[PDB]
Design a binder for this molecule. Sequence first.
Ligand SMILES: O=C(Cc1c[nH]c2ccc(O)cc12)N[C@@H](Cc1cc(F)cc(F)c1)c1ncccc1-c1ccc(Cl)cc1
Ligand SMILES: O=C(Cc1c[nH]c2ccc(O)cc12)N[C@@H](Cc1cc(F)cc(F)c1)c1ncccc1-c1ccc(Cl)cc1
Ligand SMILES: O=C(Cc1c[nH]c2ccc(O)cc12)N[C@@H](Cc1cc(F)cc(F)c1)c1ncccc1-c1ccc(Cl)cc1
Ligand SMILES: O=C(Cc1c[nH]c2ccc(O)cc12)N[C@@H](Cc1cc(F)cc(F)c1)c1ncccc1-c1ccc(Cl)cc1
Ligand SMILES: O=C(Cc1c[nH]c2ccc(O)cc12)N[C@@H](Cc1cc(F)cc(F)c1)c1ncccc1-c1ccc(Cl)cc1
Ligand SMILES: O=C(Cc1c[nH]c2ccc(O)cc12)N[C@@H](Cc1cc(F)cc(F)c1)c1ncccc1-c1ccc(Cl)cc1
Lengths: 212, 212, 208, 220, 210, 218
Amino acid sequence: PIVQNLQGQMVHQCISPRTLNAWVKVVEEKAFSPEVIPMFSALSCGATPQDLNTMLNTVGGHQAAMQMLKETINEEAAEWDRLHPGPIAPGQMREPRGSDIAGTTSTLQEQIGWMTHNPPIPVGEIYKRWIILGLNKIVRMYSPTSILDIRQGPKEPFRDYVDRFYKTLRAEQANAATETLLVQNANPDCKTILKALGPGATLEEMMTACQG
Amino acid sequence: PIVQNLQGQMVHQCISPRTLNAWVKVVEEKAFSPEVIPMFSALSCGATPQDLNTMLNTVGGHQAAMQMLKETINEEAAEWDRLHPAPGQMREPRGSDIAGTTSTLQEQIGWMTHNPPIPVGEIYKRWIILGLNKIVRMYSPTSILDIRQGPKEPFRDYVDRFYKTLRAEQASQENAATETLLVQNANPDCKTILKALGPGATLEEMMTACQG
Amino acid sequence: PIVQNLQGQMVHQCISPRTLNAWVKVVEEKAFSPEVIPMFSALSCGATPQDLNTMLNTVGGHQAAMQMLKETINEEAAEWDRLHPVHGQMREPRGSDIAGTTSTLQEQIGWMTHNPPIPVGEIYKRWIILGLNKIVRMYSPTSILDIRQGPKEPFRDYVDRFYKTLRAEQNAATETLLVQNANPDCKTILKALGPGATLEEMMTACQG
Amino acid sequence: PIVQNLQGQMVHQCISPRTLNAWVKVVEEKAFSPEVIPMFSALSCGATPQDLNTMLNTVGGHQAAMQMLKETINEEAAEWDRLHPVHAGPIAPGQMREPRGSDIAGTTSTLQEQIGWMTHNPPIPVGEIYKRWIILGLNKIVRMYSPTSILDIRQGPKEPFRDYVDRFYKTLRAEQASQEVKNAATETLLVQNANPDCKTILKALGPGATLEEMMTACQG
Amino acid sequence: PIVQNLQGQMVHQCISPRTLNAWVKVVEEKAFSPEVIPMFSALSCGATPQDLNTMLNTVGGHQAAMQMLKETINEEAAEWDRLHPVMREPRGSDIAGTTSTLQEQIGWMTHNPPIPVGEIYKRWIILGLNKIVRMYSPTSILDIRQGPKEPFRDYVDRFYKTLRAEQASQEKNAATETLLVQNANPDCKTILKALGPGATLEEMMTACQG
Amino acid sequence: PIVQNLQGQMVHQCISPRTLNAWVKVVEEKAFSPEVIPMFSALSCGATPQDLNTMLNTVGGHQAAMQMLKETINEEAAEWDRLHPVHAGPIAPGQMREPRGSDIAGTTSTLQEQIGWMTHNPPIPVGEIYKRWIILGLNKIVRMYSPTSILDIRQGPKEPFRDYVDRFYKTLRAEQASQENAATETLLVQNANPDCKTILKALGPGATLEEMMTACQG
Ligand SMILES: O=C(Cc1c[nH]c2ccc(O)cc12)N[C@@H](Cc1cc(F)cc(F)c1)c1ncccc1-c1ccc(Cl)cc1
Ligand SMILES: O=C(Cc1c[nH]c2ccc(O)cc12)N[C@@H](Cc1cc(F)cc(F)c1)c1ncccc1-c1ccc(Cl)cc1
Ligand SMILES: O=C(Cc1c[nH]c2ccc(O)cc12)N[C@@H](Cc1cc(F)cc(F)c1)c1ncccc1-c1ccc(Cl)cc1
Ligand SMILES: O=C(Cc1c[nH]c2ccc(O)cc12)N[C@@H](Cc1cc(F)cc(F)c1)c1ncccc1-c1ccc(Cl)cc1
Ligand SMILES: O=C(Cc1c[nH]c2ccc(O)cc12)N[C@@H](Cc1cc(F)cc(F)c1)c1ncccc1-c1ccc(Cl)cc1
Ligand SMILES: O=C(Cc1c[nH]c2ccc(O)cc12)N[C@@H](Cc1cc(F)cc(F)c1)c1ncccc1-c1ccc(Cl)cc1
């Protein structure tokens, strides 16, 4: 990653072993639960495209998701070569192509130069956005149940049902329709009390009333 | 977060992997026990709104509580807007800017390091801690009125359960009214000794009298 | 806490996660064994009152001890106010300012880095260590007068229990009690040694 | 390794105990799975040849693969000597002598020489060149430890499609040394070796379907 | 500790939590084996008298040994006062940290010429810990004798591990070379004396390698 | 150890608890296997003679090997005193006194003297000199501790060829103490099983180990 030397200077640093191991352990233990994405973005703070490819490469399993990730990266790189289609002025740098942002045709020197340019170009941030777009698709794919099939059990507490509802909703959406769907699929007892509270009630109010 | 450079300038640093893992471990091992809130505040020292959202996003389960937290944040942001309705006049943040939904990292750093500053991270953390206090209270299993000393339970263990329950029910907020409930719900043998101690006794004297 | 940077100035640092975790694990492992107190003083090196309240707040159990601690802190703050009554001059802290209930972080830093300093962090830690001493003495399972060498207990094990018990509660009186509560065999060997025997001599004469 | 100073100058730092122990654990746990190679490269960021030799020396077992690695490095060193022979004679003041293949591999060079090469203006990256040779030898080891051919990866009658694709592309990664390869034949081989139920659904999708569409169709 | 900064200056740092934890675990695992002493010396690198008292205070058990350590420290402190009778020079209680503030300890340690109160106190502690390792040593060196079926390597292992606790890690002496051969089993005893005098341990062990 | 500060100067730094615990662990878990030696050299990077003695002092067991190590250090120190005699007289201003063998081994030198030699211009690397002596003794320990001989390593009946080569070069590493050949190449083919040995000769002359293990893959 490109961090800050105490001279306010932007220098390149090696990815720490602690960060490498952290990202690896997150994937092995959490698979593609929705919270893996914000953990990836946080662990890749200030990363060059080379750092992002290093992080994706250290993943041992989940090679089906990784191939899907590549196919998303290639479709975003194609769009970049459209919206931002040779001599190079002194003190300046070339313009990046989609393969340069993904790190398939660019070097660490070219990436560092783009990210420390006084007219800067954040190829690491552009690449990370493409990666997160693909990770969203993978999280949607790995979600076992649709939001429509989340229904409160007969003897299941309302808290545990809302836990499953919003965790499913997080994976899918990687609003009034969600509120109507939440009350509609509560068990018939809890359901009636939710209808009796009236509309526009906060989630805190619904859960303390359904606590019986 | 925003930290101090050896050049004396407030600079932005990436949230460390050890801090991310410590916060995830706390939530997984303690859920919403009262002591989680001070640990959250300590682990988010100097945090920007983006850093606070990263910490909240790394929470795996408890999505009912997370949605409740969003509703509290939404209400605090709305009240902030109602309470905050020149060449070079800086644009001041709205509730959504403080919460980080409509503001960039660069804008958040601008407010926090301005002269005079607007501590959007400290403001946002105040809203989060309020919502976490609500969650801790709702998650508290037992009422303080139901904490009663067992016939063979040592007085110290009873007081441990009592004050830990009181902490969850008041969400760690600050009484002889608690002293009377503590004496009233002690078992008959200890209650007699506590009555004989006279009023206004310290807790240290009370537990030394009920040790035999 | 307050540490020094590379310009000779005292700068404020965020409390570190490894320090926080170390203090939590100390309370979970050692409860209120006497050695918990010096560990607290070492982990709170340079702490502001805000940092001291953070460390105490991260304790999960032992809430009976924590309430006792608040009562000790309250009495120390009241005594500070009694000894510092109100009369270019800097405002001086109240007892609640040292304890962090009525002072902001900037006020605590301003006091701790003033010339000359008012070390509200070290004053507060003093009050806290006073309270921990009472908790450790409370948690002490047995009185020192009841620590007695078993008829088949090695003299070294008896001395280990003796001095660990004395530490939680707190010299010629202790040497008298140590010899007096030994079993009749070791007691005879210790009395035959006479006065002026070190603990090393006493433990050697009874090592059999 | 050689890292940027807080002045901003390339200085030598000792290899850290955390980096050393990390590399030892990845080999004890993962052996020579394909993802071990990008982990080796990441843990040896900025490494000198001496550092690279230290990491290779901490491997306790797998000595057959380590001898193979030595032989691969020897062939790359000989090739370096054929393309970059050292001009004999005295070295100009303020200059470094030209490195031979054994200097890059760290057998006939000192730590002080390796530092002088890597921090020279312009730098001669003896550490990066040596790591390139090491990764070439590691590619061979990954293939040797992954015997199962991609042609023998077949979805079980009740194996979930996602697990079958996991085994497929993990086997392909070892065979192809983690090299990005766009090829239609390997994507038709994936459909070809799916089980009867999913293979019917995949053919009912039509040709030229993305992996996301295929895994969604066989999600049942 | 008093350690080098980055600007070439000696400054005071707080004792590290990782250092405190390492010292606690060492005592828990090894008790008072001889190798505990060099571990204590390494973990107390640059320590002030306050840091040394902090480390000793984190020891939970072993309070019999800790009281003996206090008695050794008091003897060394009393001998310091007798050898330094009355720039205020530190008394024994100042070196041990019972009557000295942290600022006074730093004032002595960083003076020119310095008075290293941390190193002096560490010497007293190590002298006291050596007496504890010796007293807690289970066996005397004279009772280490090679088993009839015991490999010679295993006998030499027990001999020097016992001699280390006995001679409290102090330094090939003639009596120890004769005692090692004298207490070997009659078979290897013959092979050793056949080699003659002044043989290396590598030659004694290769001969009796079995 | 001696490390570089932000003034480009070499300064003394305390040895870290991570380094001490790491060295203790590799000895407890791997004794004196050949891979222990490069681990000692990496963890002692930049070490003064005092640091090197600390690491050796943290070894609890293996005291027979540690006494052999002392006798190897004593013989290297005596050879240093023969080849580098100390000259009598006062020490020139701004210079260090000449180190003798016991100074390099840290028995008669102070830490400040060790720092003085290691940071002088030009530097006398007494830590690197001492470490070489230690590694010489440790190599003699790896060979004495080695159980099997390279001659007695023969391939089993149904044992895969890769497992036989694994055991072959691991034993060879202990016999040479990580020191590195048609001699070892012919001992590898001679001590194989008759099924693979036949195919090994048919491979031809000077075949690479890759070609050899692919020829006896099954
Ligand atoms: O919204 C999410 C993702 C999410 C998590 N759980 C879900 C269930 C369904 C679903 O569709 C999405 C999600 N993250 C939040 C942070 C957050 C997380 C949490 F767990 C609890 C909080 F209070 C806040 C966020 N990230 C980036 C920028 C802004 C905000 C944000 C948004 C709204 C407010 Cl009021 C404030 C900030
Ligand atoms: O009071 C609490 C929360 C709490 C914890 N346990 C409870 C059980 C029931 C309950 O209702 C609330 C709580 N925190 C304290 C710190 C503390 C924690 C502790 F454990 C023991 C101490 F001595 C002090 C605190 N935080 C922020 C600012 C000031 C103070 C404070 C307050 C009063 C004093 Cl005298 C001093 C400081
Ligand atoms: O040679 C060894 C020791 C060793 C290990 N295993 C053995 C089995 C028998 C045996 O006799 C000795 C040994 N280390 C190597 C590093 C290495 C280790 C490995 F595992 C695999 C590699 F490719 C390289 C080395 N160290 C210091 C300086 C230079 C070289 C070196 C040597 C030859 C090349 Cl081509 C390049 C560098
Ligand atoms: O491709 C691989 C190795 C790999 C892993 N699994 C495989 C299965 C078979 C196979 O032949 C090779 C491999 N590394 C990638 C990074 C990556 C890894 C991953 F897991 C998932 C991603 F989306 C991206 C890479 N490294 C260095 C430079 C560029 C790129 C690259 C390539 C293509 C795109 Cl679109 C973008 C970047
Ligand atoms: O005295 C204690 C607490 C203690 C521990 N165990 C006990 C059993 C009963 C009991 O009443 C109190 C205690 N700490 C000591 C440090 C120490 C700890 C130890 F374990 C062994 C040592 F040699 C020294 C200390 N701390 C702060 C300042 C000065 C000294 C001090 C005191 C006397 C000497 Cl001669 C030197 C320094
Ligand atoms: O001597 C010891 C203690 C010791 C350990 N084991 C023992 C068994 C019986 C016994 O009486 C004492 C001891 N430490 C040594 C270091 C060492 C440790 C080791 F294990 C193996 C080595 F080669 C060297 C040492 N420390 C401080 C200063 C100088 C030296 C020193 C001494 C002699 C040489 Cl030639 C070189 C340095």
